[PDB]
Ligand binder design. Structure first.
Ligand SMILES: [Cl-]
Ligand SMILES: [Cl-]
Ligand SMILES: [Cl-]
Ligand SMILES: [Cl-]
Ligand SMILES: [Cl-]
Ligand SMILES: [Cl-]
Ligand SMILES: [Cl-]
Ligand SMILES: [Cl-]
Ligand SMILES: [Mg+2]
Ligand SMILES: [Mg+2]
Ligand SMILES: [Mg+2]
Ligand SMILES: [Mg+2]
Ligand SMILES: [Mg+2]
Ligand SMILES: [Mg+2]
Ligand SMILES: [Mg+2]
Ligand SMILES: [Mg+2]
Lengths: 440, 440, 440, 440
């Protein structure tokens, strides 16, 4: 499952259809990023540039020109073929091959962007540009507009209107095509296999980073080279740190370990969390907290559907949590009064759900308090958790327990499809899986 | 093997000993780096900051003050303890614990750097600063100096002299302590085990990225979480691309694969290349090219010692290469005339050796044409290669062969120690290893 | 004659009437400008800021908010009252007095602009901003928009559309109100009195700068403290340098002197050039060139009216010039062929007319080749000239003669009114004026 | 009186003599400065660039290279000859004529500075640069150093040391040559004639700006085209505003007017203040305050000499002021206690003296509290004043009186020479001068 040339072209056209006549949209590639001295991080294309191109090179700009209501065309600026650069650093698409490969009308050398861009914008009414994203892109756009403003003796004119395309594009990204859902489904499956492998490999005395190693190897073998975010392996008290990434401790017999890891597959993110006993058996105290988080997730999975909202489902989870914490003596008082004072917040301090896509925290308008009404094609996470600080004023046996369980779902016409249910989360099914692996 | 608090302190003192009285040296941490939208790459500390601290947090500045020839002290600026930030993103050292943990005299909040730095520089004669490294650091230094220049009514004075500490510090880094060599020795061993594993796993039909996966998993399991540079797995014609990192092709029965991969262990880089047959057996043509590259490496390993230079050893390698290429009909003519016209350069177009340390292309002055005389404690690579382009005007059977063999060595009083000889490179030993693994 | 509070308010409303509902226009004051070290040039307000305010302080921003089609209001950011600053550098309007003084709804401290501006733009659809004019203004606008884009958890939203208000505002400025014309009429009269004074004072042996001194003193005494541009006093060969401002030479008996000088009166520019003999008597050669330039100007003054253009009148001037230069032997050949090859261009190398207003080269669209059709209310210069280089290949007696004659006019329903005809330009009237002054 | 080519050369050599061997000093011209839209302020050269060149063009850089202890040379970067630019905007020195005109060894085009500067700095140990003065200069220097740092494969090396030349150069500027003193003497005389003219012209009903006009005309006629700072004409309450420059009020019969104005002559500043009755006759109350300020000045003029300091003389003035204010009932109590509480500060809130030279507030170290011991060749102002706010809690008759009297002096071996004593300051001599002019 991937996204094809034709789908990138469909996206480009859908944007053009929303653009005013006499306008151009400019979409810039991500800069390369230094890791240390002359070495760079592995390149990650800008998600919006990727959305419209599938093109993984730096020093590139997509220009979509809508001359009027019937006529439009596309120009790519990209690195030139260069024998020496390519012998060193790799092959470049170049200008001759780009139109056919990418499905754009025209390709020009990036080195010529300052000589050419103003000529493309000359006499247009509107320029669409995501200002403030990249400094280098802003310099290019501002120079072009300045040349035009100052070029009246050469009969040049600048567009007077600049529109941020991000609201429109991000609304596009919020609703997945069936092809995007298939890619996300595959990301969910790959990520799930990785988490299953981590549970089967985990033993007391291994380091947190060892499970990271297992997870990344499993991602890679299915063709997802990189994670969509830095892997979290938080055992014991580290599980109470939401994005713990040091992963530097030896995992102890008697502690839980919380793994939050996701692959990046054809650009798209998985995002799964599983929490499980290091020694394969939940203690009573661990199980008591786990059951509340699991009920929260299972209830959310029953509820999520078109016509509800993250806010509405969040309210149901908050009640489940407050009720459970009261029953365990972690909270004291009347459930409804406790809910009204957001008494769960010391233990559940993050959102239940975020959008998921080309970014793990995907683009798209949530509405106030994430009240936006859900519709088919939206993809989101469901991640209740409870984190009991080592020094919390609660019964001693719960201190230092950090539990999150996170699945990735797609809203359908009839409810939701869970993309990540192929890795177990019922505590008895976790224990069974680990018992089987521990026998070899 | 690691670098301890006491050694970081020794380095700080050695710098201070080289500083003028009435001076301060400023060393800034690396900024965090965006991968996409709100997600960041895993943090990599600036190598020079690391060299003096072993401290892996951003928003930190080491200030070494030499008041006069007997009196000096250190101040660290670093992030404050912050409950909410730490529940989310991880633990911070903070100010109270820093002096004991790091062995500095004083710690202050990074948020206060603009209120405090000018006060530390007031009345000093010299500021040591690596200008142009980080824009954010330059803004901080320039603001402090501007406050002082403009503050005569408040009896403030700016140092009139700014000295780049990089030449002095990089000369320090060029000569490894025995403890640094032990860490590099371990990096070499970990990297070697990874390359052995790649050779034992490789089969026709696997993708290049699969061997990357094996390599990274082996790095991780020995506690080297990250590579020191982006892994190269170039099979077939891809082997002729020096830093090929796409690693996207299916490895073919009958092709070679060139793996260039190294771990980063306690900050220090390994850098190994092995080239080997995908199907476990060199063809005659592959073996003929391989033998020349191997002779070049073995000869270089015999020669490298105090009192020679990379230039001098490079000359010996060039002769070996020209001679071998003449014998195969790849070059035609008289060896000495061919050498004089650098006729090897279409096939060997990079340097034989680079320094190795906290960066894979490590700091340190090479001298003109890498003529600097070698001394004990210097660490460098030895990486001859031959790359025969698919369209080279040479006997057909050699086209598309890319071979490099790279080891990491330390110059000793009596010659060199090879840190990476635990992964095989003799062609018969490669074939034996692969035959054994292929039988299971 | 001046521009009143009510007229500034009318302009603000006319802008608001053109703005989209759900929008804000931002207009920024000019920065103060260093002359040397801690000393600054006398402050000149940004012309567009001035157009809407009549307010001559730095660190000020006019914000016009159009909430919807009936509701709108204005906010000024300006410097706070400050006892110490004012004892030193002068009185400030402050916040309490600004609404009544300027006729704005609300005033806030400039120091609070970063805390307040984003709140004013929150939830608007469009921001009108002249991007690239001032760096400091761009930083303020970009910060505000960035806060809003990134503030969705605080229910903030950025306008997605930014429109340059300069085309609309500059079109406003192009058409003068009767009150603006009265101010320009006064500027023309003041400037004319200055040029008359220069002619009456000029004697061989005086320096060019002496006539500058006379001119500036006359400007000042009528309440125009500053010139609208740097005064040009080009005697002899210096007259062939279009914007000669060194004014450093001793004026010679037998040379012409070209004075191009204009006052700035209530913000508005005069722009007059007169050329005249230093010794009070034109030579034959000087008179021969002068007559062509004068015919060009007199013809242009007869022609300029609604429905013609600068281009059309320029064609008539070019014919007059070519014809005259042919008659003198400066050009050789057939007039029409000479016109077709723009043979006048070595001697007349600038435009005949520019718009005139709050800038001497005033804002407004000229059309291609200054072809825009003239309408009542437009104000422009008429400045033919001929400049014969000291080394021109022409009859010797003409070399080093530089002559320009420039008047300022307003297009009326019935033609034009000459605002500067009160300083003489007929050569006999120049000689008479100078003869009278030279007798004392 | 001016500064010659030979003296600029002597200054350059004196700098070179202070420079380390293997070093280059870079001195940059001032940028041109926008007044409004396409119009610029009249150009003012950077004072330090001027000090070493006498060259009044922008886009120029002086490079002084000290190869070793015997060998040194100079290179100027400056604008190329350009026919079209010069026909428009004026003559340029260009490269061919610069060495002879300025006395530099070599001249190169400014357009080539980025291609040439790094080559001049290559292999030097020290670069002298005034960092933070001009952004454009910093970009040029930083680019050159970056090319060198990064150019080891081309055998380039950057100097590791950057030294601010301003402390050394400003110490040079602090001590005037006899030729500089002659120029300052002439500036003092020109400025004095202007102030005399203002007193002779002043009548009730004239505007403050009218006296500015008289002053600037007098500056101009002696060849000082521009003031050294914005002229202050503060009548009545405006006299209590130290740098009042609006000069917009009608001068009233019965008020004083305070004029602070100085010419800029061959680069050097005059700085004179005279306060006098608008109607030619001091009131008793005005005379009572005036006498204290005059005694302060006359005493300071008797005292200033080598071996004293501005601090020491300031103490004598403070006693004179406190004593006088006690006698008038403006201050109440014991003089010595009043002095100890700085009770004069509401009425005298600025320094008595500043250095004077190429800037009106000239460069040079003052010492703590301006305690530096005076030496021959130093040039400074002497400007006591008393400013009684319109709402001060003092006897009513003194409210709104602002008086300053300022002379410019040079410290000599035997005391000081007053450069500005040719304009009267004794109240009887002011009244006599004004009475004579008022009779015509
Ligand atoms: Cl390119
Ligand atoms: Cl959240
Ligand atoms: Cl902090
Ligand atoms: Cl190399
Ligand atoms: Cl303010
Ligand atoms: Cl023009
Ligand atoms: Cl140039
Ligand atoms: Cl002061
Ligand atoms: Mg997660
Ligand atoms: Mg998540
Ligand atoms: Mg390598
Ligand atoms: Mg290497
Ligand atoms: Mg003019
Ligand atoms: Mg004009
Ligand atoms: Mg003064
Ligand atoms: Mg003064």
């Amino acid at each position: 499952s991937e996204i094809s040339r034709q789908e990138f072209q469909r996206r480009r056209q859908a944007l053009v259809e929303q653009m005013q006549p006499g306008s151009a949209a400019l979409i810039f590639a991500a800069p390369e990023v230094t890791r240390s001295a002359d070495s760079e991080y592995p390149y990650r294309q800008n998600s919006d540039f990727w959305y419209f191109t599938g093109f993984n090179e730096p020093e590139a700009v997509l220009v979509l020109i809508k001359s009027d209501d019937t006529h439009n065309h596309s120009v790519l600026f990209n690195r030139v073929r260069d024998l020496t650069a390519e012998i060193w650093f790799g092959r470049r698409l170049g200008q001759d091959a780009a139109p056919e490969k990418l499905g754009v009308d025209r390709a020009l050398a990036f080195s010529e962007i300052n000589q050419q861009l103003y000529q493309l914008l000359n006499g247009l009414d509107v320029v669409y540009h995501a200002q403030g994203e990249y400094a280098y892109a802003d310099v290019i756009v501002n120079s072009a507009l300045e040349k035009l403003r100052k070029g009246s003796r050469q009969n040049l004119t600048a567009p007077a209107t600049m529109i941020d395309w991000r609201p429109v594009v991000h609304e596009m990204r919020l609703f997945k095509s069936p092809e995007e859902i298939a890619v996300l489904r595959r990301a969910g499956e790959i990520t799930a296999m990785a988490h299953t492998r981590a549970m089967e490999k985990c033993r007391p005395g291994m380091f947190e980073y060892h499970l990271e190693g297992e997870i990344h190897h499993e991602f890679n073998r299915h063709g997802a080279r990189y994670p969509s975010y830095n892997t979290i392996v938080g055992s014991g008290e580290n599980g109470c740190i939401l994005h713990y990434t040091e992963n530097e401790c030896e995992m102890r017999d008697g502690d839980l370990v919380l793994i939050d890891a996701g692959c990046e597959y054809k650009g798209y993110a998985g995002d799964i969390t599983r929490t499980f006993p290091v020694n394969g058996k939940f203690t009573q105290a661990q199980r008591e907290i786990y059951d509340i988080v699991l009920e929260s997730l299972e209830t959310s999975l029953r509820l999520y559907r078109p016509g509800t909202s993250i806010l509405e489902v969040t309210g149901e989870v908050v009640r489940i949590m407050v009720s459970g914490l009261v029953k365990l003596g972690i909270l004291k008082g009347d459930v409804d009064e406790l809910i009204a004072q957001n008494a769960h917040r010391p233990f559940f301090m993050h959102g239940l759900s975020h959008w998921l896509g080309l970014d793990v925290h995907d683009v798209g308008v949530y509405g106030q308090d994430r009240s936006r009404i859900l519709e088919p094609g939206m993809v989101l996470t469901v991640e209740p958790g409870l984190y009991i600080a080592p020094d919390a004023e609660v019964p001693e046996q719960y201190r230092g327990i950090g539990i999150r369980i996170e699945d990735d779902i797609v809203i359908t016409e009839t409810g939701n499809e869970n993309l990540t249910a192929s890795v177990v989360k019922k505590p008895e099914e976790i224990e069974a899986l680990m018992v089987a692996a521990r026998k070899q």
